Coordinates of C-alpha atoms (C1' of nucleotides) in Angstrom, one line a residue:
Chain Z
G1 CA 1.9 -2.3 -4.1
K2 CA -1.7 -2.2 -5.3
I3 CA -1.2 -4.5 -8.3
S4 CA -4.0 -7.2 -8.3
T5 CA -7.4 -5.8 -7.3
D6 CA -11.0 -6.6 -8.3
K7 CA -10.8 -4.1 -11.2
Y8 CA -7.4 -5.3 -12.2
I9 CA -7.7 -9.1 -12.0
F10 CA -5.5 -10.0 -15.0
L11 CA -4.1 -6.8 -16.6
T12 CA -2.8 -3.8 -14.8
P13 CA -3.9 -0.2 -15.6
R14 CA -0.7 0.4 -17.7
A15 CA -1.5 -2.5 -20.0
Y16 CA -4.7 -0.7 -21.0
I17 CA -2.9 2.7 -21.1
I18 CA -0.1 1.4 -23.4
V19 CA -2.4 -0.6 -25.7
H20 CA -4.5 2.5 -26.1
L21 CA -1.5 4.5 -27.3
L22 CA -0.5 1.7 -29.7
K23 CA -3.7 2.6 -31.5
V24 CA -4.5 6.3 -31.1
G25 CA -0.8 7.1 -31.4
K26 CA -1.1 10.1 -29.2
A27 CA -3.7 11.0 -26.6
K28 CA -4.3 13.2 -23.5
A29 CA -4.6 11.8 -19.9
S30 CA -8.3 12.7 -20.0
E31 CA -8.6 10.7 -23.2
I32 CA -6.7 7.7 -21.8
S33 CA -9.0 7.8 -18.8
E34 CA -12.4 8.0 -20.3
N35 CA -11.5 5.5 -23.0
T36 CA -9.8 2.9 -20.8
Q37 CA -12.4 3.4 -18.1
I38 CA -9.6 4.2 -15.6
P39 CA -9.9 7.0 -12.9
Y40 CA -7.7 9.9 -14.1
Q41 CA -5.6 10.0 -10.9
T42 CA -4.5 6.5 -11.7
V43 CA -3.6 7.4 -15.3
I44 CA -1.3 10.5 -14.6
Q45 CA 0.3 8.6 -11.7
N46 CA 1.1 5.8 -14.1
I47 CA 2.1 8.3 -16.9
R48 CA 4.6 9.9 -14.6
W49 CA 6.2 6.4 -14.2
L50 CA 6.3 5.8 -17.9
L51 CA 7.8 9.3 -18.2
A52 CA 10.5 8.3 -15.7
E53 CA 11.6 5.2 -17.7
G54 CA 11.5 6.9 -21.1
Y55 CA 8.6 4.7 -22.2
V56 CA 6.5 7.8 -23.0
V57 CA 7.2 11.4 -23.9
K58 CA 5.2 14.6 -23.5
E59 CA 4.1 16.9 -26.3
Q60 CA 3.0 20.4 -25.2
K61 CA 1.1 22.8 -27.5
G62 CA 0.9 25.6 -25.0
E63 CA -2.3 24.3 -23.3
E64 CA -2.9 20.8 -24.6
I65 CA -0.5 18.0 -23.5
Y66 CA -0.2 14.9 -25.6
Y67 CA 1.5 11.7 -24.6
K68 CA 2.9 9.1 -26.9
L69 CA 5.1 6.0 -26.8
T70 CA 8.8 6.2 -27.4
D71 CA 10.7 3.7 -29.5
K72 CA 11.7 1.8 -26.4
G73 CA 8.0 2.1 -25.4
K74 CA 6.7 0.3 -28.5
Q75 CA 9.6 -2.0 -27.8
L76 CA 8.2 -2.8 -24.4
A77 CA 4.8 -3.2 -25.8
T78 CA 5.2 -5.9 -28.5
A79 CA 7.4 -7.7 -26.1
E80 CA 4.6 -7.8 -23.5
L81 CA 2.1 -8.3 -26.2
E82 CA 3.8 -11.5 -27.4
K83 CA 4.1 -12.7 -23.8
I84 CA 0.4 -12.4 -23.4
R85 CA -0.2 -14.4 -26.6
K86 CA 2.1 -17.0 -25.2
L87 CA 0.1 -17.3 -21.9
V88 CA -3.2 -17.4 -23.9
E89 CA -1.8 -20.3 -26.1
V90 CA -0.5 -22.7 -23.4
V91 CA -3.8 -22.1 -21.5
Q92 CA -6.3 -23.0 -24.2
Chain Q
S1 CA 9.4 0.7 -11.0
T2 CA 7.9 -2.8 -10.6
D3 CA 9.6 -4.5 -13.5
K4 CA 8.0 -7.9 -12.6
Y5 CA 4.3 -7.1 -12.9
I6 CA 4.0 -4.6 -15.9
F7 CA 1.1 -5.8 -17.9
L8 CA 0.2 -9.0 -16.1
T9 CA -0.6 -9.2 -12.4
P10 CA 0.5 -12.2 -10.2
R11 CA -3.1 -13.2 -9.7
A12 CA -3.2 -13.8 -13.5
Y13 CA -0.2 -16.1 -13.6
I14 CA -1.7 -18.0 -10.6
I15 CA -5.1 -18.5 -12.4
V16 CA -3.8 -19.5 -15.9
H17 CA -1.6 -22.1 -14.1
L18 CA -4.4 -23.7 -12.2
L19 CA -6.2 -23.8 -15.5
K20 CA -3.6 -25.8 -17.4
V21 CA -2.7 -28.1 -14.5
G22 CA -6.0 -28.1 -12.7
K23 CA -4.7 -29.4 -9.3
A24 CA -1.6 -27.9 -7.8
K25 CA 0.3 -27.0 -4.6
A26 CA 1.3 -23.5 -3.3
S27 CA 5.1 -24.0 -3.6
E28 CA 4.6 -25.7 -6.9
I29 CA 2.7 -22.6 -8.2
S30 CA 5.3 -20.3 -6.8
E31 CA 8.1 -22.2 -8.4
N32 CA 6.5 -22.8 -11.8
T33 CA 5.6 -19.1 -12.1
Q34 CA 8.5 -17.5 -10.3
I35 CA 6.2 -15.7 -7.9
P36 CA 7.4 -15.3 -4.3
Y37 CA 5.5 -17.8 -2.2
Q38 CA 4.1 -15.3 0.3
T39 CA 2.4 -13.6 -2.7
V40 CA 0.9 -16.9 -3.8
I41 CA -0.8 -17.8 -0.6
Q42 CA -2.0 -14.3 0.0
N43 CA -3.7 -14.4 -3.5
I44 CA -4.8 -18.0 -2.9
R45 CA -6.7 -16.9 0.2
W46 CA -8.4 -14.1 -1.6
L47 CA -9.3 -16.5 -4.5
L48 CA -10.5 -19.0 -1.9
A49 CA -12.6 -16.2 -0.4
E50 CA -14.3 -15.3 -3.7
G51 CA -14.9 -18.9 -4.4
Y52 CA -12.7 -18.9 -7.5
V53 CA -10.6 -21.7 -6.0
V54 CA -11.1 -24.6 -3.5
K55 CA -8.7 -26.5 -1.3
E56 CA -8.2 -30.2 -1.9
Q57 CA -6.6 -31.7 1.3
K58 CA -5.8 -35.3 0.3
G59 CA -4.4 -36.7 3.5
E60 CA -1.8 -34.2 4.5
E61 CA -1.1 -33.0 1.0
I62 CA -2.6 -29.6 0.4
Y63 CA -4.0 -28.9 -3.1
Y64 CA -5.7 -25.9 -4.8
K65 CA -7.9 -26.2 -7.9
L66 CA -10.2 -23.9 -9.8
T67 CA -14.0 -24.1 -9.6
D68 CA -16.9 -23.8 -12.1
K69 CA -16.8 -20.1 -11.1
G70 CA -13.0 -19.8 -11.3
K71 CA -13.0 -21.4 -14.7
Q72 CA -15.7 -19.0 -15.9
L73 CA -13.6 -16.1 -14.7
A74 CA -10.4 -17.5 -16.2
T75 CA -11.9 -18.1 -19.7
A76 CA -14.0 -14.9 -19.5
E77 CA -11.0 -12.6 -18.6
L78 CA -8.8 -14.4 -21.1
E79 CA -11.3 -13.6 -23.8
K80 CA -11.3 -9.9 -22.8
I81 CA -7.5 -10.2 -23.4
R82 CA -7.8 -11.6 -26.9
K83 CA -10.3 -8.9 -28.0
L84 CA -7.9 -6.3 -26.7
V85 CA -4.9 -7.7 -28.5
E86 CA -6.8 -8.3 -31.8
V87 CA -6.8 -4.7 -33.0
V88 CA -3.1 -4.4 -32.3
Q89 CA -2.9 -7.3 -34.7
Chain L
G1 CA -6.3 28.4 -8.8
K2 CA -7.3 28.9 -5.2
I3 CA -4.5 29.0 -2.7
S4 CA -3.6 28.0 0.7
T5 CA -0.2 26.7 1.3
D6 CA 1.7 26.9 4.6
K7 CA 4.6 24.9 3.4
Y8 CA 5.5 25.6 -0.3
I9 CA 4.8 29.3 -0.6
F10 CA 8.5 30.1 -1.2
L11 CA 10.2 26.7 -1.8
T12 CA 9.0 23.7 -3.8
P13 CA 9.2 20.2 -2.2
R14 CA 11.4 19.6 -5.2
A15 CA 14.2 21.7 -4.0
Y16 CA 14.1 20.0 -0.6
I17 CA 14.6 16.7 -2.4
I18 CA 17.3 17.9 -4.8
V19 CA 19.3 19.5 -1.9
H20 CA 18.9 16.5 0.5
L21 CA 20.3 14.3 -2.3
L22 CA 23.5 16.3 -2.4
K23 CA 24.2 15.5 1.3
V24 CA 23.7 11.7 1.6
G25 CA 24.3 11.3 -2.1
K26 CA 21.8 8.4 -2.4
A27 CA 18.7 7.5 -0.5
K28 CA 15.6 5.4 -0.7
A29 CA 12.2 7.1 -1.1
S30 CA 11.1 6.3 2.4
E31 CA 14.4 7.8 3.5
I32 CA 14.3 11.4 2.3
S33 CA 10.6 11.5 3.2
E34 CA 11.7 11.1 6.8
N35 CA 14.7 13.4 6.8
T36 CA 12.8 16.1 4.8
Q37 CA 9.3 16.0 6.4
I38 CA 8.0 15.7 2.8
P39 CA 5.2 13.1 2.6
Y40 CA 6.0 9.8 0.9
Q41 CA 3.8 10.1 -2.1
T42 CA 5.1 13.6 -2.8
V43 CA 8.6 12.2 -2.8
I44 CA 8.2 9.4 -5.2
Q45 CA 5.9 11.4 -7.4
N46 CA 8.6 14.1 -7.6
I47 CA 11.5 11.7 -8.1
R48 CA 9.8 10.2 -11.2
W49 CA 9.8 13.8 -12.5
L50 CA 13.6 14.1 -12.0
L51 CA 14.2 10.7 -13.5
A52 CA 12.3 12.0 -16.6
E53 CA 14.6 15.1 -16.9
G54 CA 17.8 13.1 -16.1
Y55 CA 18.4 15.0 -12.9
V56 CA 18.5 11.7 -11.0
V57 CA 19.3 8.0 -11.5
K58 CA 17.9 4.8 -10.0
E59 CA 20.3 2.4 -8.3
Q60 CA 18.7 -0.8 -7.1
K61 CA 21.0 -2.5 -4.5
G62 CA 19.1 -5.7 -3.9
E63 CA 15.6 -5.1 -2.8
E64 CA 15.8 -1.4 -2.0
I65 CA 15.8 1.4 -4.6
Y66 CA 18.5 3.9 -4.1
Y67 CA 18.1 7.2 -6.0
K68 CA 21.2 9.2 -6.6
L69 CA 21.9 12.6 -8.2
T70 CA 23.4 12.9 -11.7
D71 CA 25.8 15.2 -13.5
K72 CA 22.7 17.0 -14.9
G73 CA 21.4 16.9 -11.3
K74 CA 24.6 18.5 -10.2
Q75 CA 24.6 21.3 -12.8
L76 CA 21.2 22.3 -11.7
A77 CA 21.9 21.7 -8.0
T78 CA 24.8 24.2 -7.9
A79 CA 23.5 26.5 -10.7
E80 CA 20.0 26.9 -9.1
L81 CA 21.2 27.4 -5.5
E82 CA 23.3 30.2 -7.0
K83 CA 20.5 32.4 -8.4
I84 CA 19.1 31.8 -4.9
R85 CA 21.6 33.6 -2.7
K86 CA 21.4 36.0 -5.5
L87 CA 17.7 36.7 -4.7
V88 CA 18.5 37.3 -1.0
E89 CA 21.6 39.3 -1.6
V90 CA 19.5 41.7 -3.7
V91 CA 16.9 42.1 -1.0
Chain K
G1 CA -1.8 21.6 -5.0
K2 CA 0.2 22.3 -8.1
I3 CA 3.6 23.6 -7.0
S4 CA 6.7 22.2 -8.8
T5 CA 6.1 22.4 -12.5
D6 CA 8.4 23.0 -15.5
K7 CA 8.9 26.7 -14.6
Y8 CA 9.1 26.2 -10.9
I9 CA 12.0 24.0 -10.1
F10 CA 13.2 25.6 -6.8
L11 CA 11.4 28.9 -6.2
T12 CA 7.6 29.2 -6.4
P13 CA 5.9 32.1 -8.1
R14 CA 5.1 33.9 -4.8
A15 CA 8.9 33.8 -4.3
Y16 CA 9.5 36.2 -7.2
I17 CA 6.2 38.1 -6.8
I18 CA 7.0 38.9 -3.1
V19 CA 10.7 39.8 -4.0
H20 CA 9.2 42.3 -6.5
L21 CA 7.5 44.0 -3.6
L22 CA 10.5 44.0 -1.3
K23 CA 12.2 46.0 -4.0
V24 CA 9.7 48.2 -5.8
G25 CA 7.2 48.5 -3.0
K26 CA 4.1 49.1 -5.0
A27 CA 3.8 47.4 -8.4
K28 CA 0.7 46.9 -10.5
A29 CA -0.3 43.3 -11.2
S30 CA 0.7 44.2 -14.8
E31 CA 4.2 45.3 -13.8
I32 CA 4.7 42.2 -11.8
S33 CA 3.9 39.7 -14.5
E34 CA 6.4 41.8 -16.7
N35 CA 9.3 41.8 -14.2
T36 CA 8.5 38.6 -12.5
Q37 CA 8.5 36.7 -15.8
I38 CA 5.5 34.9 -14.5
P39 CA 2.3 34.6 -16.6
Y40 CA -0.3 37.3 -16.0
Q41 CA -3.3 35.2 -15.1
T42 CA -0.9 33.7 -12.5
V43 CA 0.1 37.0 -11.0
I44 CA -3.5 38.1 -10.4
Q45 CA -4.2 34.7 -8.8
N46 CA -1.2 34.8 -6.4
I47 CA -1.9 38.4 -5.3
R48 CA -5.5 37.5 -4.8
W49 CA -4.4 34.8 -2.4
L50 CA -1.7 37.0 -0.9
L51 CA -4.3 39.7 -0.4
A52 CA -6.7 37.3 1.3
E53 CA -4.1 36.4 3.9
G54 CA -3.3 40.1 4.6
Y55 CA 0.2 39.4 3.4
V56 CA -0.3 42.2 0.8
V57 CA -2.9 45.0 0.1
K58 CA -4.0 47.3 -2.7
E59 CA -3.3 51.0 -3.0
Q60 CA -5.5 53.2 -5.2
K61 CA -3.1 55.5 -7.0
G62 CA -6.0 57.1 -8.7
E63 CA -7.2 55.0 -11.7
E64 CA -4.6 52.3 -11.0
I65 CA -4.3 49.7 -8.3
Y66 CA -0.7 49.4 -7.2
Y67 CA -0.1 46.6 -4.7
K68 CA 2.0 47.1 -1.6
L69 CA 3.7 44.8 1.0
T70 CA 2.5 44.7 4.6
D71 CA 4.4 44.2 7.9
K72 CA 2.6 40.9 7.9
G73 CA 4.0 40.2 4.4
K74 CA 7.5 41.5 5.4
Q75 CA 7.6 39.1 8.4
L76 CA 6.7 36.3 6.1
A77 CA 9.3 37.3 3.6
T78 CA 12.3 37.8 5.9
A79 CA 11.1 34.6 7.6
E80 CA 10.9 32.5 4.5
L81 CA 14.0 34.2 3.1
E82 CA 16.0 32.8 6.0
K83 CA 14.6 29.3 5.8
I84 CA 16.1 29.5 2.3
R85 CA 19.6 30.9 3.2
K86 CA 19.5 28.3 5.9
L87 CA 18.8 25.6 3.3
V88 CA 21.6 26.7 0.9
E89 CA 24.0 26.2 3.8
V90 CA 25.2 23.0 2.1
Chain U
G1 CA 10.0 -25.0 14.7
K2 CA 10.0 -22.5 17.6
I3 CA 7.2 -20.9 19.8
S4 CA 6.9 -17.3 21.0
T5 CA 3.8 -15.9 21.2
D6 CA 3.3 -13.2 23.7
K7 CA -0.3 -12.7 22.8
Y8 CA -2.1 -15.7 21.2
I9 CA -0.9 -18.4 23.7
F10 CA -4.4 -19.6 24.6
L11 CA -6.6 -17.7 22.2
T12 CA -6.4 -17.3 18.5
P13 CA -7.0 -13.9 16.7
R14 CA -9.8 -15.7 14.9
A15 CA -11.4 -16.3 18.3
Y16 CA -11.8 -12.6 19.1
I17 CA -13.0 -11.6 15.7
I18 CA -15.7 -14.2 15.3
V19 CA -16.8 -13.3 18.8
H20 CA -16.9 -9.6 18.1
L21 CA -19.3 -10.0 15.2
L22 CA -21.5 -12.3 17.2
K23 CA -22.3 -9.4 19.5
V24 CA -21.9 -6.3 17.3
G25 CA -23.8 -7.9 14.4
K26 CA -21.8 -6.2 11.6
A27 CA -18.5 -4.4 11.3
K28 CA -15.6 -3.3 9.0
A29 CA -12.0 -4.4 8.9
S30 CA -11.4 -1.2 10.8
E31 CA -14.0 -1.8 13.5
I32 CA -12.6 -5.3 14.2
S33 CA -9.0 -4.1 14.1
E34 CA -9.7 -1.2 16.5
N35 CA -11.7 -3.2 19.1
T36 CA -10.2 -6.6 19.1
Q37 CA -6.8 -4.9 19.0
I38 CA -5.8 -7.4 16.4
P39 CA -3.6 -5.9 13.7
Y40 CA -5.3 -4.9 10.4
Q41 CA -3.6 -7.4 8.1
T42 CA -4.4 -10.3 10.5
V43 CA -8.0 -9.3 10.7
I44 CA -8.6 -8.9 7.0
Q45 CA -6.7 -12.2 6.5
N46 CA -8.9 -14.1 8.9
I47 CA -12.1 -12.7 7.3
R48 CA -11.0 -14.3 4.0
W49 CA -11.0 -17.6 5.7
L50 CA -14.4 -16.9 7.3
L51 CA -15.6 -16.0 3.8
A52 CA -14.2 -19.1 2.2
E53 CA -15.9 -21.3 4.8
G54 CA -19.0 -19.3 4.4
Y55 CA -18.9 -18.4 8.1
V56 CA -19.3 -14.8 7.1
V57 CA -20.8 -12.7 4.3
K58 CA -20.1 -9.3 2.8
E59 CA -22.6 -6.6 3.4
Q60 CA -22.0 -4.0 0.7
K61 CA -23.2 -0.5 1.7
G62 CA -21.9 1.8 -1.1
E63 CA -18.2 2.4 -0.5
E64 CA -18.7 0.6 2.8
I65 CA -18.0 -3.1 3.3
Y66 CA -19.1 -4.8 6.5
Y67 CA -19.2 -8.5 7.6
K68 CA -21.4 -10.7 9.7
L69 CA -21.6 -14.4 10.6
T70 CA -23.9 -16.6 8.5
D71 CA -26.3 -19.3 9.5
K72 CA -23.5 -21.9 9.5
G73 CA -21.2 -19.2 10.9
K74 CA -23.4 -18.4 13.9
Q75 CA -24.0 -22.0 14.9
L76 CA -20.3 -22.6 14.7
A77 CA -19.6 -19.5 16.9
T78 CA -21.9 -21.0 19.5
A79 CA -20.9 -24.6 19.1
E80 CA -17.2 -24.3 19.9
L81 CA -18.1 -21.6 22.5
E82 CA -19.8 -24.3 24.5
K83 CA -16.8 -26.5 24.5
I84 CA -15.0 -23.4 25.8
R85 CA -17.4 -23.3 28.8
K86 CA -17.1 -27.1 29.0
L87 CA -13.4 -26.7 29.6
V88 CA -13.8 -23.7 32.0
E89 CA -15.7 -25.9 34.5
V90 CA -13.5 -29.1 34.4
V91 CA -11.7 -27.4 37.3
Chain X
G1 CA 3.1 -18.2 13.4
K2 CA 0.6 -21.1 13.0
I3 CA -2.0 -20.0 15.6
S4 CA -5.3 -20.3 13.7
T5 CA -6.5 -23.3 11.7
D6 CA -9.4 -25.5 10.8
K7 CA -8.7 -27.3 14.0
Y8 CA -7.5 -24.6 16.4
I9 CA -10.2 -22.1 15.3
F10 CA -11.0 -20.8 18.8
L11 CA -8.6 -22.4 21.3
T12 CA -4.9 -22.9 20.7
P13 CA -3.2 -26.4 21.2
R14 CA -1.4 -24.9 24.2
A15 CA -4.8 -24.1 25.7
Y16 CA -5.7 -27.8 25.6
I17 CA -2.3 -28.8 26.9
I18 CA -2.2 -26.4 29.9
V19 CA -5.8 -26.9 30.7
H20 CA -5.4 -30.6 31.0
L21 CA -2.5 -30.2 33.4
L22 CA -4.7 -28.0 35.7
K23 CA -6.9 -31.2 35.8
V24 CA -4.4 -34.5 35.5
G25 CA -1.5 -32.5 37.2
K26 CA 1.0 -34.7 35.8
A27 CA 0.7 -36.6 33.1
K28 CA 3.0 -37.9 30.7
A29 CA 3.4 -36.8 27.0
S30 CA 1.3 -39.5 25.4
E31 CA -1.4 -39.2 28.0
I32 CA -1.9 -35.6 26.9
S33 CA -2.4 -36.6 23.3
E34 CA -5.1 -39.2 23.8
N35 CA -7.2 -36.7 25.9
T36 CA -6.8 -33.5 23.9
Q37 CA -6.7 -35.3 20.6
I38 CA -3.5 -33.5 19.6
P39 CA -0.8 -35.2 17.5
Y40 CA 2.3 -36.4 19.5
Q41 CA 4.7 -34.3 17.5
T42 CA 2.6 -31.3 18.7
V43 CA 2.3 -32.3 22.3
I44 CA 6.1 -32.3 22.3
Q45 CA 6.9 -29.1 20.5
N46 CA 4.8 -27.2 22.9
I47 CA 6.0 -29.0 26.1
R48 CA 9.5 -28.2 25.0
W49 CA 8.4 -24.5 25.0
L50 CA 6.6 -24.8 28.3
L51 CA 9.7 -26.4 29.9
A52 CA 12.0 -23.6 28.8
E53 CA 9.6 -21.1 30.4
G54 CA 9.4 -23.2 33.6
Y55 CA 5.7 -22.8 33.4
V56 CA 5.5 -26.6 33.7
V57 CA 8.3 -28.8 35.0
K58 CA 8.9 -32.6 34.6
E59 CA 8.8 -34.9 37.6
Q60 CA 10.4 -38.3 37.2
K61 CA 8.4 -41.3 38.6
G62 CA 10.1 -44.5 37.5
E63 CA 10.8 -44.1 33.8
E64 CA 7.8 -42.2 32.4
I65 CA 8.2 -38.5 32.3
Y66 CA 5.7 -36.5 34.3
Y67 CA 4.6 -32.9 33.8
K68 CA 3.2 -30.9 36.7
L69 CA 2.0 -27.3 36.9
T70 CA 4.6 -25.1 38.6
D71 CA 3.6 -22.0 40.4
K72 CA 4.3 -19.9 37.3
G73 CA 2.1 -22.2 35.3
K74 CA -0.7 -21.7 37.8
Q75 CA -0.5 -17.9 37.5
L76 CA -0.3 -18.1 33.7
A77 CA -3.0 -20.7 33.3
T78 CA -5.3 -18.6 35.6
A79 CA -4.4 -15.4 33.7
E80 CA -5.5 -17.1 30.4
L81 CA -8.7 -18.6 31.8
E82 CA -9.7 -15.3 33.4
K83 CA -9.3 -13.5 30.1
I84 CA -11.2 -16.3 28.4
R85 CA -14.1 -15.7 30.7
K86 CA -14.2 -12.0 29.8
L87 CA -14.2 -12.5 26.0
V88 CA -17.2 -14.8 26.3
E89 CA -18.9 -12.3 28.5
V90 CA -18.5 -9.3 26.1
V91 CA -19.8 -11.5 23.3
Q92 CA -23.1 -11.7 25.0
Chain F
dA1 C1' 10.4 -41.3 23.3
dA2 C1' 12.3 -37.3 21.8
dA3 C1' 14.8 -34.2 19.1
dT4 C1' 16.6 -33.1 14.0
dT5 C1' 14.6 -32.0 9.5
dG6 C1' 11.3 -30.5 6.5
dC7 C1' 7.0 -28.8 4.1
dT8 C1' 3.3 -25.8 4.6
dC9 C1' 0.6 -22.2 6.4
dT10 C1' 0.1 -17.9 10.0
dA11 C1' 1.1 -13.5 12.0
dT12 C1' 2.3 -8.9 10.8
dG13 C1' 5.3 -5.4 9.4
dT14 C1' 7.9 -2.4 5.4
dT15 C1' 7.0 -0.5 1.3
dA16 C1' 4.1 0.7 -2.4
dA17 C1' 0.3 1.6 -5.8
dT18 C1' -4.8 2.7 -6.3
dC19 C1' -7.6 6.4 -6.6
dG20 C1' -10.1 10.1 -4.0
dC21 C1' -9.7 15.3 -2.5
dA22 C1' -8.0 20.1 -2.1
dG23 C1' -5.3 22.7 -4.4
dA24 C1' -2.8 25.6 -8.1
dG25 C1' -0.5 27.1 -12.5
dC26 C1' -2.5 29.3 -16.7
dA27 C1' -4.8 29.4 -21.0
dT28 C1' -10.0 30.4 -22.2
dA29 C1' -14.0 32.4 -22.4
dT30 C1' -16.3 36.6 -20.4
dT31 C1' -16.8 41.2 -18.3
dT32 C1' -19.8 44.0 -21.1
Chain J
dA1 C1' -6.4 45.4 -21.0
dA2 C1' -7.0 43.1 -17.6
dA3 C1' -10.1 40.7 -14.2
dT4 C1' -13.7 37.4 -13.1
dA5 C1' -15.3 33.6 -13.4
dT6 C1' -13.3 29.7 -15.5
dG7 C1' -12.2 25.8 -17.5
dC8 C1' -8.3 22.7 -18.3
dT9 C1' -4.8 19.8 -16.7
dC10 C1' -1.5 18.4 -13.3
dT11 C1' 0.3 18.3 -8.2
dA12 C1' 0.3 17.5 -3.1
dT13 C1' -0.9 14.1 -0.1
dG14 C1' -4.1 11.0 2.6
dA15 C1' -6.3 6.6 3.1
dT16 C1' -6.9 1.5 1.8
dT17 C1' -4.9 -2.5 0.3
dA18 C1' -1.4 -5.4 -2.2
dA19 C1' 3.4 -7.4 -2.8
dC20 C1' 6.5 -10.0 0.0
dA21 C1' 9.6 -10.7 3.7
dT22 C1' 10.6 -12.3 8.5
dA23 C1' 9.4 -15.2 12.5
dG24 C1' 7.2 -18.2 13.7
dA25 C1' 4.3 -22.9 14.5
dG26 C1' 1.3 -27.1 13.2
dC27 C1' 2.7 -31.6 12.0
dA28 C1' 4.7 -35.5 9.5
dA29 C1' 9.1 -38.6 8.6
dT30 C1' 14.1 -39.2 9.9
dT31 C1' 17.6 -39.7 13.1
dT32 C1' 19.7 -39.6 18.5

DNA sequence: AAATTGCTCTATGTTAATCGCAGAGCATATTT
DNA sequence: AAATATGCTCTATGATTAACATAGAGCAATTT
């Protein structure tokens, strides 16, 4: 699929999406988009995926939808986080 | 459901490698990074097109190494990574 | 919410997927999209929704991803298609 | 557009809205939302679209606008209603 | 290994492409793929090579991306083309 | 397959091989190499293919293998050349 | 000399992921 | 109340390209 492109040379859109949640805790798609500088359509499309694999869960308050990492989500993230660290250490 | 390229892209692994070994061959890159060969060449051609990498044909042996521009990119992107991982630390 | 649909004005592309899954049991994304006339993207985008609810399960058999219905996907499959014939019996 | 959501798993709103007309004939937008179990703002929207297509039209019962089904709408109903029956076949 | 080309038996896809741009001036992946009847992937892939060698440059026009031979690209397109004619008269 | 390269940018190796036969008629393998500057291992791989297609058949004269253009190889070779002529014409 | 073997790159198709556009379901803000 | 414009926010799906596999093919070095 469309993994490595000019905009995504090293990290994929999800990398930015997840990392953003690790900080804000919970945020809307619109939030994720404008903050990570990623076109909305790419965000929700990725969110759906994360929702399929239990990495993220919804949070409806009638009108406003919030997304947040699941325990296995944060599990995925430190794991990938440390892997990055590894890559950046061998390299330099 | 691409469980292989979650956070990092293949292009990334390819770069970082040519940054730690400098000179390398396609199959060698593929093997050392567990990235299907056909993905390596494809990305190599793009990289070669952007001038981030150059070919080094020594006799019949084909080699690919980074360039002043490729290294700039490599280090530049890598830094962007660190700044992104910092606040999570 | 302006409207113009000549395809899903009574049935959601979701039902077409759910149902088709009962027949063959398991099928790649490309697969149902062909036997259901439902565009590819719409299929995958909708199967990720079912995976979220637990109405379907992923079964990778080598290089191809085979999506199969689940117990929860069966409850709904038979329970929903019930209130359906219900609708048409009443009218 | 937005079709299959959390409320609409199999049958779209129009599915119920139209069924309401097959049964009660003329029903105010208000009475639809109530029987249809579909949110009001939604009912108005769908009828507006259904009106546009000539699938349904208004009837001024004095100070109240009751909406009625049309032969155009009936044909669509019976038609769709059979593509469904046909689907449940399995 | 083994040979079985039904198309490129005397001409390379890179031969058509280079040529097309020499007369059209500028074009997109699509324009090349449609005219030269060379498949998309093959076209785009050969452009990368032309870019690497500097035989072609990108002309960015908004969301539009065209290509055209360069100084060294043109002279090449005309150089080998002569050797082509050279061969066509050896008979 | 390997059709385009730094060497065979415009013309394929076959092109060179066939086109020389239309002009030496029968030539041996090594004679083809020296003229068209194509490695022996290549002059062979392609002949092997040409033989199987009957486009060009071998004629024994002493001990050196000869290769002459059969009738099929004439039609083919003329079909390629005629199309070559076109391409260069539209380019202009 | 030629055919077997072997490494590397080419052609090109199947599937898939980006991100743009036209919806649509519904809660808000307005209609005054 | 309910109706219009309405503003959110997500879905349906089309178009461009990437991931990666299959079938070549250019060329050594080995073996018939």
